[PDB]
Subunit: 151 residues, 2 copies
Amino acid sequence: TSENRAQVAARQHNRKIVEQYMHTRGEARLKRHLLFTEDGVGGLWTTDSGQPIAIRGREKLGEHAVWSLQCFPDWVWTDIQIFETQDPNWFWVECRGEGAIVFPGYPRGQYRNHFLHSFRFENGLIKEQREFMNPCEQFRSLGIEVPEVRR
Amino acid sequence: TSENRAQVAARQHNRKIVEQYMHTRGEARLKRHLLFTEDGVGGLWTTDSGQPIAIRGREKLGEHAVWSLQCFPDWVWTDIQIFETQDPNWFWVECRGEGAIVFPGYPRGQYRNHFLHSFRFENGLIKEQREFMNPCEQFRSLGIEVPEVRR
């Protein structure tokens, strides 16, 4: 019907934003927050602490980009696979990401990981982005030792 | 067209198998391998070692279920969300999973995690299942200490 039209319009536009998000590099990273809703949330759902580190609101998201550009100066996402779903406001992306890791008083390291990203949209802006990676890989990249599960 | 018909037939059937997989509990777990192709692969893509622990072939998958039923005796998946994609032979599932963890010479613990599952199908059987979780949560459940990233 007409709901169809809006939902199909929805999907195709939303996809473009996912694409745009995934290809954002360099200083453009400082304006990627403009792709969210005002109230929008982005962050890392897989942490050493077991709680998500979420950043809520387009302005805290812009602020976070400075720290991100500082700590991951050359970060690129590669091997991008975008998954549309039965919900036109929900997408998943499977990819890789690599670049230097510059933590303060840890040595410069090279960080690579496998990531899954969830994007939910509201009115054609990102209402919720979430990323999922294996925190062990980061521990490694910082010269932090990873415990062995002996199965 | 006709390709349409086969792809739509594809999706609806495939979904039923995802559902069936996700609801498999108890001793039924010993026959869940029958949902794969002969050549089929299942396993854990997020590990402490950084390599996937994959089990290849319906018979090694059946064998693995014994160890699984032994080590996670009451395991249930909850909060199941199944994502169909633009590819009718590819599905993602977001869920939780919890149950007891019985590792040999580690104490019995209670293990909970957040999981993402990828299912790819070939001729209506699972050609590749992959799961993604945060290994830190398991380390915890075994009284293994988790290192702190101090960001």
